[PDB]
Design a protein around this ligand. Structure first.
Ligand SMILES: *[C@@H]1O[C@H](CO)[C@@H](O)[C@H](O)[C@H]1NC(C)=O
Ligand SMILES: *[C@@H]1O[C@H](CO)[C@@H](O)[C@H](O)[C@H]1NC(C)=O
Ligand SMILES: [Ca+2]
Ligand SMILES: [Ca+2]
Ligand SMILES: [Ca+2]
Ligand SMILES: [Ca+2]
Lengths: 48, 276
């Protein structure tokens, strides 16, 4: 009952649309650092 | 000074025999037994130590001289068997599939071994000759060897892939392993539990005697297969009742110690000479 009809978008009036939540799945890769002194790395030693 | 090691002792063939010495060896030595827990369990007692001690006293040993020791079983006694004691008699119950470990224990205690340490993760190790073995003792001694050729590359096995290593004794408490003498080897032995020593075999520890209780004579103390000598210190008595076994021991103790000797005792209760 208004001027604005057939506009593409998503207003903030009722975004949930009766849903408890919107979900998304996927894979999540990470290459972050970490301290590992438990190695105490000088074993690759040459057995002789 | 030496004790006279390189000086001859001219004797004679007409000197008269000096008289008996059984009394003095009884009054000096200390007899000592190693029996399984099964023996006490079947005896169902706890004054039996006292009864046996008094029987030995009537047999001719002073009171504080017979010492009893208990081990759970042969394989568990095999892990560092410390003979804390002077005349050792190891009663040993035979049961099938314990042939090899029982023989290994008999070898280890009957013969004197000079053992050096081994650092498994670092160095390769040979066996010098016929008298050398590797003795591995601990809670779980799984031994996997990889022999190396002239080019330091394993034969039948790659030094990197431990699966290809040839297993030579798995999950024993004691393992006396021989390998072809003159080839370097890489060993993968579970260093947390088991410890492995490079042991030469000196002459016989002619103090401890082993009394097998069950089946036929099987103890091949000599790892070489061409020879299976029978030592007088390896006795074998059939049985049904542990009380009968102990009474036989007490009755015939004089003969057993006459077979054994006292001079071959070491200060350490350890069953080998650790020479670092
Ligand atoms: C040694 O034993 C013999 C056995 O007849 C005995 O005659 C002798 O007296 C003993 N030696 C000593 C010093 O008593
Ligand atoms: C033996 O191999 C296992 C294989 O996982 C390894 O974990 C262990 O560190 C190795 N031990 C030695 C002494 O090389
Ligand atoms: Ca292999
Ligand atoms: Ca063994
Ligand atoms: Ca050998
Ligand atoms: Ca043999």
């Amino acid at each position: 009952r208004t001027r604005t009809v057939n506009l593409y978008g998503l207003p903030a009036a009722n975004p949930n649309n009766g849903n408890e939540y919107y979900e998304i799945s996927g894979r999540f890769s990470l290459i972050s650092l970490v301290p590992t002194n438990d190695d105490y790395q000088t074993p690759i030693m040459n057995s002789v | 000074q030496n004790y006279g090691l390189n000086i001859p002792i001219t004797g004679s063939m007409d000197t008269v025999y000096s008289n008996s010495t059984r009394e003095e060896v009884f009054l000096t030595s200390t007899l000592c037994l190693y029996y399984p827990t099964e023996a006490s369990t079947q005896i169902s007692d706890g004054e039996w130590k006292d009864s046996l001690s008094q029987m030995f006293l009537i047999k001719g040993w002073p009171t504080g001289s017979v010492y009893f020791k208990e081990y759970s079983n042969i394989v568990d006694f095999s892990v560092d068997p410390q003979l804390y004691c002077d005349y050792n008699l190891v009663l040993m119950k035979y049961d099938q599939s314990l042939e090899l470990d029982m023989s290994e224990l008999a070898d280890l205690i009957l013969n004197e071994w000079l053992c050096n340490p081994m650092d498994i993760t670092l160095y390769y190790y040979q066996q010098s000759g016929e008298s050398n073995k590797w003795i591995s003792m601990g809670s779980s001694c799984t031994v996997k060897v990889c022999p190396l050729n002239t080019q330091t590359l394993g034969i039948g096995c790659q030094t990197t892939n431990v699966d290809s290593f040839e297993t030579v004794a798995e999950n024993e408490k004691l393992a006396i392993v021989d390998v072809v003498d003159g080839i370097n080897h890489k060993i993968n032995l579970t260093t947390t539990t088991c410890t492995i020593r490079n042991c030469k075999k000196l002459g016989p520890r002619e103090n401890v005697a082993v009394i097998q209780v069950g089946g036929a004579n099987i103890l091949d103390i000599t790892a070489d297969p061409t020879t299976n000598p029978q030592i007088e210190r390896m006795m074998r008595v059939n049985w049904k009742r542990w009380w009968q076994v102990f009474y036989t021991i007490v009755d015939y103790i004089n003969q057993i110690v006459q077979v054994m000797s006292k001079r071959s005792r070491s200060l350490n209760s350890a069953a080998f000479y650790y020479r670092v």
